[PDB]
Amino acid sequence: HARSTGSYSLVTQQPLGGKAQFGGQRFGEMEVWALEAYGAAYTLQEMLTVKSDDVNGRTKMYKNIVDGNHQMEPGMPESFNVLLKEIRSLGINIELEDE
Amino acid sequence: ARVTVQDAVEKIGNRFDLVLVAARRARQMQVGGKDPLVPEENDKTTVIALREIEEGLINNQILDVRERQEQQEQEAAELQAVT
Amino acid sequence: KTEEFDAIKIALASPDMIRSWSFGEVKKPETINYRTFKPERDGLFCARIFGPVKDYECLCGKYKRLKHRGVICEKCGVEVTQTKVRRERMGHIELASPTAHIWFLKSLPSRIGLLLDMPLRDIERVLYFESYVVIEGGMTNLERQQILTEEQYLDALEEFGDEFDAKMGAEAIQALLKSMDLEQECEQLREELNETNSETKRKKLTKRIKLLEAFVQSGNKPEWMILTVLPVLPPDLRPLVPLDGGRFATSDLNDLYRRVINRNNRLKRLLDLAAPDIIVRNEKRMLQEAVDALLDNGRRGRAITGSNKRPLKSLADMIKGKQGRFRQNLLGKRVDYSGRSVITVGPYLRLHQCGLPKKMALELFKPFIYGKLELRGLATTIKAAKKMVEREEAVVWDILDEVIREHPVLLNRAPTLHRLGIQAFEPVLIEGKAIQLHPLVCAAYNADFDGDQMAVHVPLTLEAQLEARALMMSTNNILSPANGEPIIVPSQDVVLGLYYMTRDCVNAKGEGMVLTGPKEAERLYRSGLASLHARVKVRITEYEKDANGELVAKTSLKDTTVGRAILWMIVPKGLPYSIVNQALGKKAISKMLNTCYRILGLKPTVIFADQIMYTGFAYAARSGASVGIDDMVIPEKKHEIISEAEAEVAEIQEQFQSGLVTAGERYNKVIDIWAAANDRVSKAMMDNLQTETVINRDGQEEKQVSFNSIYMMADSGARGSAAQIRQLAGMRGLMAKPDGSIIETPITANFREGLNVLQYFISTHGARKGLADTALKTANSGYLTRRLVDVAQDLVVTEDDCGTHEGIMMTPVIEGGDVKEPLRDRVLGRVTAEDVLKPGTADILVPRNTLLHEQWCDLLEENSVDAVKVRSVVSCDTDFGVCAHCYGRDLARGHIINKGEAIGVIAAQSIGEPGTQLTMRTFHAAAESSIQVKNKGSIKLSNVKSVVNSSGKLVITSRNTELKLIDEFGRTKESYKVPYGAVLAKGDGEQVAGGETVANWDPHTMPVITEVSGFVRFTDMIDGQTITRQTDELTGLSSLVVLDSAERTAGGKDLRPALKIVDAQGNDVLIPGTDMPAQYFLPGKAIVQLEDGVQISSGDTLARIPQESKDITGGLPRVADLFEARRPKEPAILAEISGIVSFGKETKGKRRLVITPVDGSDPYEEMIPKWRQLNVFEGERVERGDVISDGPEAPHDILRLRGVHAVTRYIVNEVQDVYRLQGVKINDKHIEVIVRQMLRKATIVNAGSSDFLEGEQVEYSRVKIANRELEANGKVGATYSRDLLGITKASLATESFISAASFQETTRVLTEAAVAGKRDELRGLKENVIVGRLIPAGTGYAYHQDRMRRRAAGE
DNA sequence: GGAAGATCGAAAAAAGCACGCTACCGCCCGCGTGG
DNA sequence: CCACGCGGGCGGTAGCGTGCTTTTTTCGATCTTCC
RNA sequence: UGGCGGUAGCGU
Ligand SMILES: [Mg+2]
Ligand SMILES: [Zn+2]
Ligand SMILES: [Zn+2]
């Protein structure tokens, strides 16, 4: 099974899973550990934000690759926004400092 | 035409700033429209940058020195044009 | 707002802030209409409150274009904007009555209960509308915080009128919290703690003070812990998935919110109509239950279920847990441009190449193909490129071929254990539907071609491609990061082929021929005129490296085999010919590869490895090695041997029939006889197999190493071992019962011949044992690896050199009789802490700070140096990170460790990966007294007080005496622990031969040894009252036995027996050492044969005290115990100080120990259990750190009594012993890194000029910084004591709350951070990974330091 | 001189329990009132 | 006599009951040392 | 071109 640009989940905006649903392979936690074990850091950001759940990052990556420029926009993962909103839905006051 | 970069990290050192300088050089070839000094035997930007690192023509110091020279010369040309 | 991202600040949310967040108020419990898809007004899903339904479209259709963007409608009041606004827009539910927050109530310790200083049960009873609480009882007997029952409340109402205030529920709690004064309570509790000096008041009052201080410092108010207006999740975060047909997928959150809204509406209606107090009370209680269900389902009692008859998911349940949002879609997430497929072996692939299917390459690189097609002009638009791709022309294949040219792809395995689990390759287009993988790298992946599936990812950006070419590359990964040994190693058929290319026959075709070069050898072999095993003489031109690295060629007529001449072709121009003129076993090949890498470098080494793989594969194919039933030779004597063994066992059995021997001895002799028979059979079979072939050599017969195929696989080491060949053609051996007992009879039939039913059934026990062991081992190994990774996530290299002059000691490890690990490998790659001096000359052999490479190690071992001080990460003075010099040489690369490397993850993964090798299940005594040396050398006694005896032999009087046999070179070779009261053959400094009995001692009793000579006076012991003259008829004598304290009278137990040595006159000898009188206080239950008035010499055994004469942990449980610092079930008591030990009056039938210092008073009168035996005597000058009793050590005790170096040494030694027992190797630096991460907390002893609280525990780096600053200003620095914490506890106690929440525990660290108002900086790897920014370990270290210097410049 | 601080031991509660992949089953609903 | 609604638990004078292990808290019961 | 849970099985 192989996927380049498939569908995405409604809540996390992440690629689906399973061959029948044309999903994408899961980057496990030990994969992240091994990536940190090497000196690779831009590849981790590739695995984390641009290629998985940053919708603006996904669109910019696709447009840049079509244009040929292999440049990156970090962006903000949507899963972190989901977690922030849900924690704020409780009595906790997690937020952003201005600085 | 590149399988081992040991002679490249030995030239640069620390195996980390080499990646950054090679990325800058590859971006200069690809989107910056620069001319690869070493011959291009049907290869793309990253390996030309790595081979340029190997030959010692490009490192961090020459790169930012050339960038500063280009910036100052283009600034001089622009101020001459507006005047 | 990336630049706005600098830290995460959390706290309690006030109702004002909750109202500010909300864009509206939800009133009715409705959802989108089922008849029409438009959502209903003021429901869970809405249009005026939250965002619109579709992009730039009004709900009522007033505006449907970007022309009216950002315009509020008036027909339905819906903002015209994008749909994404539905994800960051929230609403507020206005509760009719106040409700308590459940995280601050049920997460122990209860924050509400702790702040109110009331029991949790009372708070719960008051809260759930069943019990009444007083708010202000006035001047009457009703106090401030008093719990009232209904009847008691009514009685108080009649007696004291209406002046007393007693509300009903959460309103009362909120009123009480508001009425509480933070600072007044804080100061009152502070003064009470100052003047209480009571242990029960020492605890739970510091916690209250800390909670009060946290509340005061932060803006959080206690009343904010009681919810009055609650927030709701944005509609997109709880979507109503459209199921097939008219059905809509149910959402648990939507159901819970509907329940809460219905409950609130019903309560509002009841309050408006002025319902009776009982009805509104029940309504409020069930509203509180609904709030329980919404906030955290099942926390209090039954979880509210649904149509599935199983508990529903609320916010808290899926925030935490394995499937929770924190660690399921945040720490690791599915990615695009990825694929997976089964793998197959491909021999024609270079070391830096992999085989990718055409379809996989076409699908994965689709955007690149689209871009290249657009650039080429073949496709005008993206749609045309898509059509061309789905049509599969030839131009798209050419474009794909151009794209893949030097675009590496990352391949990894699903169970990625160690660092080498994922590696990049340069893919090449192949046919088929499977990923072709390089054979050599398979051992790196630990993936056999039996159906395993590889996963492939494709980098896009230039930085990722350079990471692929630089660090993801397999060529750069040549040395393992755990021990430094090469990871790639030829194995299986390859080495087998080389074996067949190096074995030499005697009468092979072409013997005696003389060739000029390897080319003629190849010509002769391919022409068929000679065989590979022929012995010939060839002219070899060996190229060697001389001064300045030049190559010198020497031509010599050497004698070898033609196969070795062929092998010489692929050998590069640096290696000597002697590396090939051997039998070429697996270890020989590994040594040749190591020498090639060391001499010529990595670039020739990769090509050499590819060439040797090719040659080995080709000549293994040409060899045609095969296994047959006739190749399996059973030794002829074996049957006969079995017969005699049977005869032997019969005789032994006959003894058990005659009663001469017991059943146990019979079984032991049976086991020994069968083991001896098995050894004899194995030896006979090996002798048969190794040299069976007999060959004529132009004359008489002669012997040579056999050509049997099974012997080839056994000797070459390709696959199989001596034990397996023994099972195969010898005998299976002595099998074991599942409990662990050895079966009386062994399996006497080979695998080649038939096995009876019983033997197979017996073997199934061990088979199932091992299989279940591995099956249960996988999970524990994974859990331990995860915990270790979490513990050492933060540790990265941040500085070059600390400049610290303190380092750990390094000596070869000796357990007695053997040196398990020499000094060379333990000190290899470690920077010396201080100057290494030549022994006996006071000359600087090694300078202060040099990296110890191979030459330095050779120089060190040549000069017979055994002790080296080396810098360690434990002593690394740098805060928030370790320095490069202290860590030492990197294992993967020979150079010093570069700045930035995250060695913590490396250490965690390296320690975790051998977890599958360890065994968890416990497996399954022997008593030895005398000590016999193995080697011959000088004898040395350390920490010893010795007394001469009548025969002149020394007797040990010291508990911690150590005996060492040291070689003539000056290095210790044997080390043993000699117990108290042991006779010595010789004194210190006398040469002894091997096998001599240096010492002997009594196994089951401890003697009492006197240091003076004189008569014995029976002082302070009285028959019956204190001792009993118990008459042994077997000895025929009445011996005095000291009674137990309970057996003795009160005066009897107080007057414990005291053996006083006097002279003939009768006065005390008084000891020559000191002036205080000679007193040997007999301990309890001691039995004395000696009678009163008996002359004894110095060193005589006054009395013997009996003692009892078993710990089986395993591989994984022992490692977990060591890492989590679990307290052993029987902690050994050790002296906190140095002084005289004394007994006190027994308390609760247990012993009181008092250690009185020479100068200071005795601080410790700690209680000792009676059942636990005491090693120390009544009166002994015991030092701090000495063992008062014998038992397993407690690492916390070692940390308190001794320095952190002792704890590090103990942990390293234990873990390394467990790991080496299983046969695997792990470098000590990883364990040291884990220990350093473990010792990160310090408790203040004196406040000093710093603001740190007296009893608070804070990070050690903060204490160091504060002390350095205070010393700079001249103020007195605060004193700290380092504390040991469990790995899980240490990880949960880190400053970063996000990283702690990423661990197992959740809703406990979050609640503490919320009540403390903690601010988390993004300074950790895990935190940045959660963020998505560049991690500050790899290439992101430069970016992070650039950001830090930019921030510093801005400041 | 016999209660309050300290201890001990049992009970009760919380928390976790490696990773991928494949297949299918239920995602409404049944009983109680108002037009 | 159908459509909304509501609360959704099986089982039963209620209570969530059954061959894991570790850690933390609590509470009653007792031992002991002083006001 | 709609995925959310649960159950069972498979490979390490
Ligand atoms: Mg396999
Ligand atoms: Zn409208
Ligand atoms: Zn250091």
mmCIF file of all heavy atoms in Angstrom, chain C residues 261-291:
data_model
loop_
_atom_site.group_PDB
_atom_site.id
_atom_site.type_symbol
_atom_site.label_atom_id
_atom_site.label_comp_id
_atom_site.label_asym_id
_atom_site.label_seq_id
_atom_site.Cartn_x
_atom_site.Cartn_y
_atom_site.Cartn_z
ATOM 1 N N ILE C 261 -27.072 19.798 29.284
ATOM 2 C CA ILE C 261 -27.953 20.912 28.945
ATOM 3 C C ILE C 261 -29.385 20.615 29.372
ATOM 4 O O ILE C 261 -30.081 21.491 29.901
ATOM 5 C CB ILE C 261 -27.858 21.232 27.443
ATOM 6 C CG1 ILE C 261 -26.578 22.010 27.148
ATOM 7 C CG2 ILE C 261 -29.053 22.056 26.999
ATOM 8 C CD1 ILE C 261 -26.635 23.453 27.601
ATOM 9 N N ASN C 262 -29.851 19.382 29.151
ATOM 10 C CA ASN C 262 -31.182 19.004 29.612
ATOM 11 C C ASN C 262 -31.291 19.132 31.124
ATOM 12 O O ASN C 262 -32.297 19.631 31.644
ATOM 13 C CB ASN C 262 -31.506 17.574 29.179
ATOM 14 C CG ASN C 262 -32.433 17.521 27.984
ATOM 15 O OD1 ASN C 262 -33.456 18.204 27.948
ATOM 16 N ND2 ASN C 262 -32.081 16.704 26.998
ATOM 17 N N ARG C 263 -30.260 18.688 31.845
ATOM 18 C CA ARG C 263 -30.278 18.785 33.299
ATOM 19 C C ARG C 263 -30.317 20.236 33.759
ATOM 20 O O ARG C 263 -31.064 20.585 34.680
ATOM 21 C CB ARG C 263 -29.061 18.063 33.871
ATOM 22 C CG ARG C 263 -29.320 17.395 35.197
ATOM 23 C CD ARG C 263 -30.519 16.468 35.122
ATOM 24 N NE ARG C 263 -30.597 15.692 33.889
ATOM 25 C CZ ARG C 263 -29.828 14.650 33.605
ATOM 26 N NH1 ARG C 263 -28.891 14.232 34.441
ATOM 27 N NH2 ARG C 263 -30.008 14.007 32.456
ATOM 28 N N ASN C 264 -29.520 21.098 33.123
ATOM 29 C CA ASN C 264 -29.509 22.509 33.495
ATOM 30 C C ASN C 264 -30.855 23.164 33.210
ATOM 31 O O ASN C 264 -31.348 23.960 34.017
ATOM 32 C CB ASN C 264 -28.389 23.238 32.753
ATOM 33 C CG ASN C 264 -28.073 24.591 33.359
ATOM 34 O OD1 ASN C 264 -28.637 24.972 34.385
ATOM 35 N ND2 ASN C 264 -27.166 25.325 32.727
ATOM 36 N N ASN C 265 -31.463 22.843 32.066
ATOM 37 C CA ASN C 265 -32.772 23.400 31.743
ATOM 38 C C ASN C 265 -33.827 22.940 32.741
ATOM 39 O O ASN C 265 -34.671 23.734 33.176
ATOM 40 C CB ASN C 265 -33.173 23.011 30.321
ATOM 41 C CG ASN C 265 -32.362 23.740 29.269
ATOM 42 O OD1 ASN C 265 -31.247 24.189 29.531
ATOM 43 N ND2 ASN C 265 -32.921 23.863 28.071
ATOM 44 N N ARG C 266 -33.798 21.657 33.113
ATOM 45 C CA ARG C 266 -34.755 21.156 34.093
ATOM 46 C C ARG C 266 -34.562 21.830 35.445
ATOM 47 O O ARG C 266 -35.539 22.177 36.118
ATOM 48 C CB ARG C 266 -34.630 19.638 34.223
ATOM 49 C CG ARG C 266 -35.681 19.009 35.121
ATOM 50 C CD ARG C 266 -36.922 18.623 34.332
ATOM 51 N NE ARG C 266 -36.596 17.842 33.145
ATOM 52 C CZ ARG C 266 -36.292 16.552 33.157
ATOM 53 N NH1 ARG C 266 -36.267 15.857 34.284
ATOM 54 N NH2 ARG C 266 -36.008 15.941 32.011
ATOM 55 N N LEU C 267 -33.307 22.022 35.861
ATOM 56 C CA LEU C 267 -33.051 22.706 37.125
ATOM 57 C C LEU C 267 -33.538 24.148 37.083
ATOM 58 O O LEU C 267 -34.109 24.647 38.060
ATOM 59 C CB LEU C 267 -31.561 22.653 37.464
ATOM 60 C CG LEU C 267 -31.159 23.372 38.754
ATOM 61 C CD1 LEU C 267 -31.927 22.815 39.942
ATOM 62 C CD2 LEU C 267 -29.663 23.266 38.988
ATOM 63 N N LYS C 268 -33.316 24.837 35.961
ATOM 64 C CA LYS C 268 -33.806 26.205 35.823
ATOM 65 C C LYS C 268 -35.326 26.254 35.906
ATOM 66 O O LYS C 268 -35.892 27.128 36.574
ATOM 67 C CB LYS C 268 -33.325 26.807 34.503
ATOM 68 C CG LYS C 268 -31.853 27.178 34.478
ATOM 69 C CD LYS C 268 -31.466 27.772 33.134
ATOM 70 C CE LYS C 268 -29.985 28.105 33.080
ATOM 71 N NZ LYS C 268 -29.587 28.632 31.745
ATOM 72 N N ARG C 269 -36.002 25.320 35.233
ATOM 73 C CA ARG C 269 -37.459 25.283 35.282
ATOM 74 C C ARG C 269 -37.958 25.013 36.696
ATOM 75 O O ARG C 269 -38.921 25.640 37.154
ATOM 76 C CB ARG C 269 -37.992 24.226 34.315
ATOM 77 C CG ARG C 269 -38.203 24.730 32.898
ATOM 78 C CD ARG C 269 -39.528 24.243 32.331
ATOM 79 N NE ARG C 269 -39.841 22.883 32.752
ATOM 80 C CZ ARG C 269 -39.306 21.791 32.224
ATOM 81 N NH1 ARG C 269 -38.422 21.859 31.242
ATOM 82 N NH2 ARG C 269 -39.666 20.600 32.691
ATOM 83 N N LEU C 270 -37.317 24.080 37.403
ATOM 84 C CA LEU C 270 -37.726 23.775 38.770
ATOM 85 C C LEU C 270 -37.510 24.967 39.693
ATOM 86 O O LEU C 270 -38.351 25.259 40.550
ATOM 87 C CB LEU C 270 -36.966 22.552 39.284
ATOM 88 C CG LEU C 270 -37.314 21.217 38.622
ATOM 89 C CD1 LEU C 270 -36.722 20.059 39.406
ATOM 90 C CD2 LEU C 270 -38.821 21.059 38.483
ATOM 91 N N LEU C 271 -36.383 25.665 39.538
ATOM 92 C CA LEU C 271 -36.117 26.839 40.365
ATOM 93 C C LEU C 271 -37.111 27.956 40.074
ATOM 94 O O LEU C 271 -37.549 28.658 40.993
ATOM 95 C CB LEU C 271 -34.682 27.319 40.146
ATOM 96 C CG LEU C 271 -34.238 28.562 40.919
ATOM 97 C CD1 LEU C 271 -32.882 28.329 41.565
ATOM 98 C CD2 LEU C 271 -34.194 29.780 40.008
ATOM 99 N N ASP C 272 -37.471 28.142 38.801
ATOM 100 C CA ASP C 272 -38.415 29.196 38.444
ATOM 101 C C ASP C 272 -39.791 28.941 39.048
ATOM 102 O O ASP C 272 -40.463 29.880 39.493
ATOM 103 C CB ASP C 272 -38.510 29.322 36.925
ATOM 104 C CG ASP C 272 -37.261 29.922 36.311
ATOM 105 O OD1 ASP C 272 -36.608 30.750 36.981
ATOM 106 O OD2 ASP C 272 -36.930 29.566 35.161
ATOM 107 N N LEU C 273 -40.228 27.683 39.074
ATOM 108 C CA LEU C 273 -41.544 27.334 39.592
ATOM 109 C C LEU C 273 -41.572 27.182 41.107
ATOM 110 O O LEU C 273 -42.637 26.884 41.658
ATOM 111 C CB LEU C 273 -42.041 26.042 38.937
ATOM 112 C CG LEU C 273 -42.147 26.053 37.411
ATOM 113 C CD1 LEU C 273 -42.766 24.759 36.905
ATOM 114 C CD2 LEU C 273 -42.947 27.256 36.936
ATOM 115 N N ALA C 274 -40.436 27.369 41.783
ATOM 116 C CA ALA C 274 -40.336 27.255 43.238
ATOM 117 C C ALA C 274 -40.770 25.866 43.711
ATOM 118 O O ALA C 274 -41.732 25.699 44.464
ATOM 119 C CB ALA C 274 -41.142 28.358 43.935
ATOM 120 N N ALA C 275 -40.033 24.862 43.244
ATOM 121 C CA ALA C 275 -40.303 23.485 43.614
ATOM 122 C C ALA C 275 -39.917 23.240 45.072
ATOM 123 O O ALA C 275 -39.142 24.003 45.655
ATOM 124 C CB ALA C 275 -39.540 22.535 42.693
ATOM 125 N N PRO C 276 -40.457 22.187 45.687
ATOM 126 C CA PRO C 276 -40.057 21.856 47.061
ATOM 127 C C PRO C 276 -38.572 21.540 47.146
ATOM 128 O O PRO C 276 -37.946 21.116 46.172
ATOM 129 C CB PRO C 276 -40.914 20.629 47.400
ATOM 130 C CG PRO C 276 -41.427 20.126 46.086
ATOM 131 C CD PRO C 276 -41.565 21.335 45.224
ATOM 132 N N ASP C 277 -38.009 21.766 48.337
ATOM 133 C CA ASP C 277 -36.565 21.664 48.519
ATOM 134 C C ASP C 277 -36.036 20.278 48.168
ATOM 135 O O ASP C 277 -34.910 20.155 47.675
ATOM 136 C CB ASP C 277 -36.190 22.025 49.956
ATOM 137 C CG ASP C 277 -36.763 21.057 50.970
ATOM 138 O OD1 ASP C 277 -37.841 20.483 50.702
ATOM 139 O OD2 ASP C 277 -36.137 20.867 52.033
ATOM 140 N N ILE C 278 -36.824 19.228 48.409
ATOM 141 C CA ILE C 278 -36.370 17.876 48.096
ATOM 142 C C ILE C 278 -36.182 17.705 46.593
ATOM 143 O O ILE C 278 -35.189 17.121 46.138
ATOM 144 C CB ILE C 278 -37.356 16.839 48.662
ATOM 145 C CG1 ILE C 278 -37.667 17.137 50.131
ATOM 146 C CG2 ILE C 278 -36.797 15.433 48.508
ATOM 147 C CD1 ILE C 278 -36.460 17.072 51.038
ATOM 148 N N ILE C 279 -37.130 18.208 45.799
ATOM 149 C CA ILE C 279 -37.075 18.012 44.353
ATOM 150 C C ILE C 279 -35.886 18.754 43.755
ATOM 151 O O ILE C 279 -35.127 18.199 42.954
ATOM 152 C CB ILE C 279 -38.401 18.449 43.707
ATOM 153 C CG1 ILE C 279 -39.551 17.575 44.212
ATOM 154 C CG2 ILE C 279 -38.308 18.368 42.195
ATOM 155 C CD1 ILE C 279 -39.309 16.091 44.041
ATOM 156 N N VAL C 280 -35.703 20.022 44.136
ATOM 157 C CA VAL C 280 -34.569 20.779 43.620
ATOM 158 C C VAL C 280 -33.257 20.214 44.149
ATOM 159 O O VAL C 280 -32.231 20.271 43.465
ATOM 160 C CB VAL C 280 -34.714 22.278 43.945
ATOM 161 C CG1 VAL C 280 -35.911 22.863 43.215
ATOM 162 C CG2 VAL C 280 -34.840 22.496 45.442
ATOM 163 N N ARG C 281 -33.264 19.656 45.360
ATOM 164 C CA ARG C 281 -32.066 19.018 45.896
ATOM 165 C C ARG C 281 -31.664 17.815 45.051
ATOM 166 O O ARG C 281 -30.491 17.652 44.693
ATOM 167 C CB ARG C 281 -32.318 18.603 47.345
ATOM 168 C CG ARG C 281 -31.117 18.040 48.072
ATOM 169 C CD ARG C 281 -31.432 17.853 49.548
ATOM 170 N NE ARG C 281 -31.624 19.127 50.233
ATOM 171 C CZ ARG C 281 -32.804 19.646 50.542
ATOM 172 N NH1 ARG C 281 -33.932 19.025 50.241
ATOM 173 N NH2 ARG C 281 -32.854 20.818 51.169
ATOM 174 N N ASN C 282 -32.637 16.964 44.716
ATOM 175 C CA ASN C 282 -32.354 15.819 43.854
ATOM 176 C C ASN C 282 -31.917 16.272 42.468
ATOM 177 O O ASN C 282 -31.021 15.668 41.860
ATOM 178 C CB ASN C 282 -33.582 14.915 43.763
ATOM 179 C CG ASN C 282 -33.933 14.274 45.089
ATOM 180 O OD1 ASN C 282 -33.051 13.885 45.856
ATOM 181 N ND2 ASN C 282 -35.225 14.160 45.369
ATOM 182 N N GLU C 283 -32.545 17.329 41.947
ATOM 183 C CA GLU C 283 -32.149 17.860 40.647
ATOM 184 C C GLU C 283 -30.706 18.343 40.665
ATOM 185 O O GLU C 283 -29.946 18.083 39.727
ATOM 186 C CB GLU C 283 -33.088 18.993 40.235
ATOM 187 C CG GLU C 283 -32.899 19.456 38.804
ATOM 188 C CD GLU C 283 -33.425 18.457 37.795
ATOM 189 O OE1 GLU C 283 -34.376 17.720 38.128
ATOM 190 O OE2 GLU C 283 -32.881 18.403 36.673
ATOM 191 N N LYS C 284 -30.309 19.047 41.727
ATOM 192 C CA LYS C 284 -28.931 19.510 41.842
ATOM 193 C C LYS C 284 -27.964 18.341 41.971
ATOM 194 O O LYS C 284 -26.874 18.361 41.387
ATOM 195 C CB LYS C 284 -28.794 20.457 43.033
ATOM 196 C CG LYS C 284 -29.172 21.897 42.732
ATOM 197 C CD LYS C 284 -29.878 22.539 43.916
ATOM 198 C CE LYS C 284 -29.971 24.047 43.754
ATOM 199 N NZ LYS C 284 -28.793 24.742 44.342
ATOM 200 N N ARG C 285 -28.341 17.313 42.736
ATOM 201 C CA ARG C 285 -27.472 16.148 42.884
ATOM 202 C C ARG C 285 -27.258 15.441 41.552
ATOM 203 O O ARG C 285 -26.129 15.067 41.208
ATOM 204 C CB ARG C 285 -28.060 15.184 43.913
ATOM 205 C CG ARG C 285 -27.025 14.370 44.667
ATOM 206 C CD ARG C 285 -27.680 13.438 45.675
ATOM 207 N NE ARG C 285 -28.796 12.699 45.095
ATOM 208 C CZ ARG C 285 -30.071 12.908 45.394
ATOM 209 N NH1 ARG C 285 -30.434 13.833 46.269
ATOM 210 N NH2 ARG C 285 -31.006 12.172 44.799
ATOM 211 N N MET C 286 -28.326 15.256 40.782
ATOM 212 C CA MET C 286 -28.188 14.581 39.499
ATOM 213 C C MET C 286 -27.544 15.480 38.443
ATOM 214 O O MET C 286 -26.877 14.975 37.531
ATOM 215 C CB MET C 286 -29.552 14.015 39.090
ATOM 216 C CG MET C 286 -29.886 13.939 37.622
ATOM 217 S SD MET C 286 -31.647 13.549 37.480
ATOM 218 C CE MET C 286 -32.420 15.158 37.594
ATOM 219 N N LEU C 287 -27.656 16.804 38.582
ATOM 220 C CA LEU C 287 -26.839 17.702 37.770
ATOM 221 C C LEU C 287 -25.359 17.546 38.097
ATOM 222 O O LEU C 287 -24.510 17.561 37.198
ATOM 223 C CB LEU C 287 -27.277 19.152 37.981
ATOM 224 C CG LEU C 287 -26.472 20.204 37.214
ATOM 225 C CD1 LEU C 287 -26.864 20.233 35.746
ATOM 226 C CD2 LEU C 287 -26.634 21.577 37.845
ATOM 227 N N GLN C 288 -25.031 17.408 39.382
ATOM 228 C CA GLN C 288 -23.647 17.164 39.775
ATOM 229 C C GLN C 288 -23.148 15.841 39.213
ATOM 230 O O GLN C 288 -21.992 15.730 38.793
ATOM 231 C CB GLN C 288 -23.525 17.185 41.298
ATOM 232 C CG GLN C 288 -22.147 16.822 41.822
ATOM 233 C CD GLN C 288 -21.178 17.982 41.756
ATOM 234 O OE1 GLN C 288 -21.438 19.054 42.304
ATOM 235 N NE2 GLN C 288 -20.052 17.777 41.083
ATOM 236 N N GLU C 289 -24.009 14.821 39.204
ATOM 237 C CA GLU C 289 -23.636 13.546 38.597
ATOM 238 C C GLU C 289 -23.398 13.692 37.096
ATOM 239 O O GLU C 289 -22.472 13.087 36.541
ATOM 240 C CB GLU C 289 -24.714 12.499 38.873
ATOM 241 C CG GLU C 289 -24.815 12.089 40.334
ATOM 242 C CD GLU C 289 -26.249 11.919 40.795
ATOM 243 O OE1 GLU C 289 -27.097 11.520 39.969
ATOM 244 O OE2 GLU C 289 -26.530 12.188 41.983
ATOM 245 N N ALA C 290 -24.228 14.491 36.420
ATOM 246 C CA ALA C 290 -24.010 14.749 35.000
ATOM 247 C C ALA C 290 -22.685 15.469 34.767
ATOM 248 O O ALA C 290 -21.973 15.184 33.796
ATOM 249 C CB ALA C 290 -25.170 15.561 34.428
ATOM 250 N N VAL C 291 -22.349 16.420 35.641
ATOM 251 C CA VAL C 291 -21.066 17.109 35.535
ATOM 252 C C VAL C 291 -19.915 16.134 35.762
ATOM 253 O O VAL C 291 -18.875 16.216 35.099
ATOM 254 C CB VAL C 291 -21.014 18.295 36.516
ATOM 255 C CG1 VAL C 291 -19.611 18.877 36.580
ATOM 256 C CG2 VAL C 291 -22.014 19.362 36.103
#
